[PDB]
Design a protein around this ligand. Structure first.
Ligand SMILES: Nc1ncnc2c1ncn2[C@@H]1O[C@H](COP(=O)(O)O)[C@@H](O)[C@H]1O
Ligand SMILES: Nc1ncnc2c1ncn2[C@@H]1O[C@H](COP(=O)(O)O)[C@@H](O)[C@H]1O
Ligand SMILES: Nc1ncnc2c1ncn2[C@@H]1O[C@H](COP(=O)(O)O)[C@@H](O)[C@H]1O
Ligand SMILES: Nc1ncnc2c1ncn2[C@@H]1O[C@H](COP(=O)(O)O)[C@@H](O)[C@H]1O
Ligand SMILES: [Cl-]
Ligand SMILES: [Cl-]
Ligand SMILES: [Cl-]
Ligand SMILES: [Cl-]
Lengths: 463, 456, 456, 457
């Protein structure tokens, strides 16, 4: 087992889905290395502020951040039924021992690690989402002027373009990118707060010096790479934070489910397919994204409920739930972005299928323009409307009652009434003349909104 | 290793929480051995109904149900991008004589769906006795404490006395509703059987040269081999994903029951009236609420999934079900194992309970005091007013001074209540305020609980 | 006015969606009438058990509800049940003293909610049965009409229009069984006192437990319920609300799936909702919209039950006013709308036929190979030859936007001369539907009609 | 009547809970007045950009924005089975000159969607001041009570003392995050504008005879008339239903905050340490807040599911759901904030009840400082001797239902002779509250007051 024995349950998010990078962020090695990192930082800062901590103690700790004895820690945890003290012991064993965790409570490691993990998990998602957006934007640009049947109520509607529709998709994902970046940036550090949030043990440690306590809190926050620490906590950071993070993943799920549902419907229509020659192909990656996106939406109710029933300075009914929902929300989001990147790399378009479908539907939407051209030729709008209405009903009935191709244009051609227009008919039915401002909209959107958001991710010159 | 390297995420449900039995039911070994079992049962039934399958082919399959080369299946899935096809191939590799007849006529869901149904039913069967055992233990506690008065709480404020056992029956009753729900869903679970790519059995009909009777026989025979009483007549490719709603909905409701019970226990621990088996934290109860919450959340997965299945099925159910079905059962198992341990060891502190009743009961006793004063030949009008002023004073000592409730002491030295003084002991006997609590416990256990547990 | 002024928010469920019958079940008039009806049943039973009571000015004033007075009382007391005892007592001067004799507020509040829930289920059941019956008529009508099967919303082994309708019918039949079980299993709260201990009643009957049990039996029987709880706190267990809204949520999932399928078939022009060029399946869209809210709402009672403390907390009350009515008014609307969709549902066989003509040839190549082998050809060779023609046809379709000409390519090819005479029969769509039509028949005879018989 | 007759279901959110102002924002009068406002603005802008619309047509529409014939609209809707077309016809009745130009070029969503956006923003602007007031009132209380020791609770068991004001800061902090969220969502809300049937503006482009600049300017002009800084460039028929998730998710999070705060107050009410403003009193307002906050949380699943299954340029399966969830979420949030303002206005505290509970629990928390004070004694010996006294004190409390007599046991014991002199001082409750008071002062100065300064009036 690197994901373990097949003789016991193994989470598919670990064993089947998420990237090894995100799997590692939520691994026990990452967690426990981070606990040691935090104890190292507490030591460093406690020394600076005058506590009795030698340079030598700080070096032996720094030298053993990664040398974690998991068999030992498991045995100690089993005996003490307390994970942090088990790790204090184990870290002391290879180390500095008497001053590890000096003055701190358990959440100094547990809760601050959770915050580092959440932020690092966001930092993994962000470039992946930007890559998907960038890949879709290339597609939108390429296909900006390609007419395609519009759909409202999934019924034929005013033509759009393949690239304009792709912009609906991109825009939602751009809102996600802004949301994730905001949440990542605004995440605050718990810091040093004590059992109930009052910093009592640290205040005793610093012999009543409130300013040394405030300095320590700022120092560990800065070492952890956070710009801001909470002033106010109970035992832990407010679980409202977990709602904020999972809500943004839930809304990302909704965007992806919509996008991948559209692609599935386009695949049925044979207009677009997932990246690669068999005649029948199933949109399995999009089906998978929808399946996983749904679980992201579902999971938002976990942190909403948890926060709602936290009592006072903390109840421990948050712990098991968070171990599952935070890790699994991010493993799920990771998988979805990885798959969606793959989807976005070489979407297959069939312009001749799209054209055929337009040829079958457009004439029903062209009748106003035909009416205008007759009236421009000095015809009667009224008479023309009545006549064209009857031809259209007849064409529609051939389609449904006979299962034939649409013959409206043929009907108009052999009708002498429309003789003043027969020479304009090809021009009047040119699909590019029905797509409104779709291509211009693509260009403006990409220039004004999409590329500026992508500029921090970019990662040839005139000479 | 067994649970994997510490360099990946490892589910807490596997490594921390659930029993080995439930973890085994949701293991890849059990899943794939069951795929092979289903292929064996298909071959046996098909041979019986006249298809060209040999005893040697059958013996080969039977001999290799557990002999699963997980490495080969992983490689072949990477190549084929199809999990069932990968396992058909892998099973044909260790069963070369049988290779050509494995999966004959079937679509992938034949093994996938039917195995999930077998797993769901077996998971229900592990839960049901554990739930019965929790109910039995709480029933014993309820009988033992049926007559033990305790302060009633409405709005979490002092109310008409109950008994420790009577309150316990609130917990038990919800859990009995859960036992009944789980049993009904278990007994009512139908097998998908043999249905074909779109549910029409077209492949099987062709194999049997248009003999509809043989197709129906095949469906009956695999169903019976699988230990199910009934198969669907109607399916698309999959069994209706409405089934997953039915199963996870009863688990969600069980989560709500547990969350409430364990909330009350956590409050009782604050009150120092009851504890789980000087600072002592109700951590098992906290863990149960925490996991019960997840059980409730998960119900939204199958509701959504079934709502957007298109036609004879879409594959957007598959990843989701891999996550939620196992998680729901592992979560439920864990709660019931933990609740078993809580139920085994509940400690009651009667002296604390009695102290609290003595602090609160005098304020609820004023009516009784009036009636005795009245029957002694006193003014219902005047006795109310006299007692009300003493009560206002006593209430101020409690809230304004943080003092003990001295309402009875007040009445004892007030001569207007002379007719009543001899009776005060008896007028404030907490046993006389519990209404029918203890009788309710006895009737409930005899009429409702014991009969439900008799089968376990 | 009847739905109020347009200058405030008015629920669309009342003003736009639900039937007047369902609206009236969740009306204040129905609610407060039932309060008085309960008060009459309480006084009647109390008299039969010998309390001091002679009932007719109560039975007189069941409908004579002075809403103006009651609102003034409630402002004054900030307690709805208190307000209506005073009001009913105002118009009932002869009985004011004996109204609510012994009871806590939940005697009217909670039992009325159970009466309302059961009456609401009783409005839904016939509606659901009727929809099922209409869909069954349609399934039988179209049992043999071949239609393109769909998995992943890609072409798959043919089904029939009627067989696909059976997928929809089955999910609804499960809903009908669920709704009937919950209706039949609903227990009355009866007479239970403030914390569930019947202390006030025990007192009233001077310690006679038997009479308290009898009273409880009597009011339950008067309310038309078979069974009361033995065990309650102040209220019936809010687990009941989970059981009810969960079955509604599952109904929403069924309906959302069915109406999604209809919307897809509407895009394909194979089906249309009953009678401009553009035809939109707006009733099916509305059903999906509302079904979605029905699934959403299950999280309300789940959360509520999970955080009820001890013998009850009042944080259930506002929530239940919203979610219970809304769930039933939503479900009423969906059933009404779905009935309307079923009535005149339009099928276009020639559209269905044309699409099968475009897709079936790609699924027919195995049968053509078999016919050629039978004519003494190589399986392998024939496969290669038909593969090249199939790729040509697929390119016409996807690369050129043409009609599928595979059958024509085979017809004009001399290699396939041994089966040219058989092609028309080899491509007969009815020969590709497997057991679809027989399954419709078996399902309707064994499962649907027996289920509907009781609703005849 | 005003909320309708008692013979039908009447939403309790209208009839029983929400403020009349929020009820008005989600009323039909407001909705259909706003549809008319949007039609007028469209006509003004189109006229300016050169379409054949006259001043008297504009004046006619302007004169009739409130003159809504609801009976006629209902009859038209029963006839047309379409709400926007019914209202176009009905407006055209009271505006006969303008009738032919009402809705020119627009699709139905031009009024429906833009009105919803105006409504969401106006609803957000009604909540924000209410939330600010709650925060202010709690901040006042937190400052007053900043140094009042009270038992800390983890796992709802005795823990290191906090203060009444510090604990209040937990509540205030969550609500400040809500205030920031609501403001953000409000400020970032974009207008749908003029987009056409599938969002391509084809109809407008043709009206302007192919002049893209005119189409772009029309969209800008209506957006500016509606008081929005920014319009979408990209839409289908509708604004993206992701917007509805963004708004209801912030409301759901506020529900979570409120549920937690009011759960704490209900627990304090049990302990008799704090009560809601004016012997047995029930925290019924806090209970109702929890009840409604729960519904606000539940509602988040509606928009999530809706957005997830919107096909292409839109499907109509959003419409009925949005009629219910958007109004209800806001009417629920309104009610909660109205009630919470009342709860926050005069919280009752009982210091002597608080003090007694601290006296019962603090000895068990003070044992470390006793050992420190003894340690010129022995850390090992003092710890073993103090342990047995704590076992004796704990069994009195639990097994015998008595008062905590640990301090007495120490006082009588000759061993602790050298510490008896300082025992009162060692058990001073203010010495156990850590930095609670200072944390409150810094929080209020740094984080809360600056957030509230924009709401001074
Ligand atoms: N106040 C606390 N803060 C942090 N961890 C705790 C606290 N109390 C107990 N624990 C430990 O945290 C872990 C919780 O386990 P679980 O419920 O499985 O997440 C166990 O090791 C507990 O012993
Ligand atoms: N119609 C089908 N029935 C069963 N399994 C399928 C079907 N189509 C594809 N699969 C396979 O099902 C698995 C789905 O993977 P996941 O989405 O990760 O659960 C993949 O290996 C697919 O190739
Ligand atoms: N124990 C109780 N049983 C029944 N109703 C109560 C109880 N306590 C208060 N009430 C009333 O129940 C109603 C709750 O209103 P709401 O929270 O708006 O549903 C109010 O009129 C309360 O005064
Ligand atoms: N494409 C559309 N855009 C806006 N409204 C529409 C559209 N199609 C239909 N409607 C109308 O929108 C309303 C939807 O009503 P409901 O489904 O009850 O919310 C009905 O009056 C419909 O006729
Ligand atoms: Cl700390
Ligand atoms: Cl099968
Ligand atoms: Cl009662
Ligand atoms: Cl528009």
């Amino acid at each position: 087992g690197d994901h373990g024995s097949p003789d016991s349950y193994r989470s598919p998010l670990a064993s089947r889905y998420a990237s090894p990078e995100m799997c590692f962020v939520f691994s026990d090695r990452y967690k426990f290395r981070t606990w040691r990192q935090l104890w190292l930082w507490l030591a460093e800062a406690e020394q600076t502020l005058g506590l009795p901590i030698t340079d030598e103690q700080i070096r032996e700790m720094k030298s053993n951040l990664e040398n974690i004895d998991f068999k030992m820690a498991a045995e100690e945890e089993k005996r003490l039924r307390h994970d942090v003290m088990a790790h204090v012991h184990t870290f002391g064993h290879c180390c500095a021992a008497g001053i590890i965790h000096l003055g701190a409570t358990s959440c100094y490691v547990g809760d601050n690690t959770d915050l580092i993990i959440l932020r690092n998990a966001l930092d993994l998602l962000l470039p992946k989402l930007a890559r998907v957006i960038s890949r879709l934007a290339d597609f939108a640009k390429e296909r900006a002027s390609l007419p395609t049947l519009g759909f409202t109520h999934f019924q034929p509607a005013q033509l759009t373009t393949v690239g304009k529709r792709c912009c609906l998709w991109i825009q939602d994902l751009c809102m996600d990118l802004q949301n994730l970046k905001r949440v990542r940036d605004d995440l605050r550090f718990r810091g040093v707060k004590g059992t109930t949030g009052t910093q009592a043990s640290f205040l005793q440690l610093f012999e009543g010096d409130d300013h040394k306590v405030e300095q320590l809190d700022k120092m560990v926050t800065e070492k952890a790479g956070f710009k801001r620490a909470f002033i106010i906590t109970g035992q832990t950071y407010t679980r409202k934070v977990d709602i904020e993070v999972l809500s943004v993943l839930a809304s990302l799920g909704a965007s992806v489910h919509k996008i991948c549902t559209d692609i599935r419907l386009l695949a049925n229509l044979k207009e677009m397919e997932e990246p690669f020659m068999p005649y029948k192909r199933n949109p399995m990656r999009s089906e998978r994204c929808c399946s996983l996106a749904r679980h992201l939406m579902t999971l938002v109710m976990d942190p909403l409920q948890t926060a709602s029933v936290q009592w006072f300075e903390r109840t421990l009914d948050d712990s098991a739930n968070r171990r599952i929902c935070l890790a699994e929300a991010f493993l799920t989001a990771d998988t979805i972005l990885n798959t969606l990147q793959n989807i976005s790399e070489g979407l297959v378009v069939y312009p001749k299928v799209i054209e055929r479908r337009i040829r079958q539907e457009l004439p029903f939407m062209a009748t106003e323009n035909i009416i205008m051209a007759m009236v421009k030729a000095g015809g009667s709008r009224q008479d023309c409307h009545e006549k064209i209405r009857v031809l259209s009903q007849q064409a529609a009935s051939v389609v449904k009652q006979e299962g034939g191709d649409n013959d409206l244009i043929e009907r108009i051609q052999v009708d002498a009434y429309f003789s003043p227009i027969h020479s304009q008919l090809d021009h009047l039915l040119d699909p590019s003349s029905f797509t409104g401002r779709a291509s211009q909209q693509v260009q403006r959107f990409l220039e004004e909104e999409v590329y500026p958001l992508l500029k921090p991710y970019e990662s040839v010159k005139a000479e």
